[PDB]
Swiss-Prot record, chain A:
A lipid is attached at G116 (Phosphatidylethanolamine amidated glycine). It is found in: Cytoplasmic vesicle, Autophagosome membrane; Endomembrane system; Cytoplasm, Cytoskeleton; Golgi apparatus membrane. Its main location: membrane. Residues 117 form a propeptide. GO terms for biological process: autophagosome assembly; autophagosome maturation; cellular response to nitrogen starvation; chemical synaptic transmission; extrinsic apoptotic signaling pathway via death domain receptors; microtubule cytoskeleton organization; mitophagy; positive regulation of proteasomal ubiquitin-dependent protein catabolic process. This is Gamma-aminobutyric acid receptor-associated protein. The gene is GABARAP. GO terms for cellular component: actin cytoskeleton; autophagosome; autophagosome membrane; axoneme; cytoplasmic vesicle; cytosol; GABA-ergic synapse; Golgi membrane.
From Swiss-Prot, chain B:
Expressed in osteoclast and their mononuclear precursors (at protein level). Directly interacts with ATG5 and associates with the ATG12-ATG5-ATG16L complex. Interacts with p62/SQSTM1; this interaction is required to recruit WDFY3 to cytoplasmic bodies and to PML bodies. Directly interacts with GABARAP, GABARAPL1 and GABARAPL2; the interaction with GABARAP is required for WDFY3 recruitment to MAP1LC3B-positive p62/SQSTM1 bodies. Weakly interacts with MAP1LC3C; this interaction is direct. Does not interact with MAP1LC3A, nor MAP1LC3B. Interacts with TRAF6. The chain holds residues 3341 to 3352 of 3526 of the full protein. This is WD repeat and FYVE domain-containing protein 3. Changing V9A: Decreases interaction with GABARAP and MAP1LC3C. Required for selective macroautophagy (aggrephagy). Acts as an adapter protein by linking specific proteins destined for degradation to the core autophagic machinery members, such as the ATG5-ATG12-ATG16L E3-like ligase, SQSTM1 and LC3. Along with p62/SQSTM1, involved in the formation and autophagic degradation of cytoplasmic ubiquitin-containing inclusions (p62 bodies, ALIS/aggresome-like induced structures). Along with SQSTM1, required to recruit ubiquitinated proteins to PML bodies in the nucleus. Important for normal brain development. The LIR (LC3-interacting region) motif mediates the interaction with MAP1LC3C and other ATG8 family members. The FYVE domain mediates binding to phosphatidylinositol 3-phosphate (PtdIns3P). A motif (LC3-interacting region (LIR)) lies at residues 6-9. Changing D4A: Decreased interaction with GABARAP, no effect on interaction with MAP1LC3B. It comes from Homo sapiens (Human). Changing F6A: Abolishes interaction with GABARAP and MAP1LC3C. It is linked to Microcephaly 18, primary, autosomal dominant: A form of microcephaly, a disease defined as a head circumference more than 3 standard deviations below the age, sex and ethnically matched mean. Brain weight is markedly reduced and the cerebral cortex is disproportionately small. MCPH18 affected individuals manifest microcephaly with mild to moderate intellectual disability. It is found in: Nucleus membrane; Cytoplasm, Cytosol; Nucleus, PML body; Membrane.
């Protein structure tokens, strides 16, 4: 799944930054969040987030929802590696399993239950 | 809230 952030920030610079930020704010997890191609819903203000390790995916839905001012009837789905993480994982667990060699975790969101329609 | 280029996401 293409990411703009990866496209325009060189790996080794993503890696030094991710290492620093883990070392500097350890009880939070660094997350890149970008709208899925062809998602019809709101675009996000910023894309770099430092998230409490013990926040649930579920709870993170509410926070992101509120940041893009979704309509009640709008849907929101998350995608890590083309796959939905279950609401019942922590962001910390998601980070452990799914972070990349640059120390970031990458999440795309959509109004479709499939990336990326 | 926003330091080091990251939104410090709080429980809220």
């Amino acid at each position: 799944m293409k990411f703009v952030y990866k496209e325009e920030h060189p790996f080794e610079k993503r890696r030094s930054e991710g290492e620093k930020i883990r070392k500097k704010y350890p009880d939070r997890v660094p997350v890149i969040v970008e709208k899925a191609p062809k998602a019809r819903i709101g675009d996000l203000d910023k894309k770099k987030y430092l998230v409490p390790s013990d926040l649930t995916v579920g709870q993170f839905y509410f926070l992101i929802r509120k940041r893009i001012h979704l309509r009640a009837e709008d849907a929101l789905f998350f995608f890590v590696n083309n796959v939905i993480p279950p609401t019942s994982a922590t962001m910390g667990q998601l980070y452990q399993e799914h972070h990349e060699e640059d120390f970031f975790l990458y999440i795309a969101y959509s109004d479709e239950s499939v990336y990326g329609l | 809230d926003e330091k080091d280029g990251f939104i410090f996401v709080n429980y809220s």
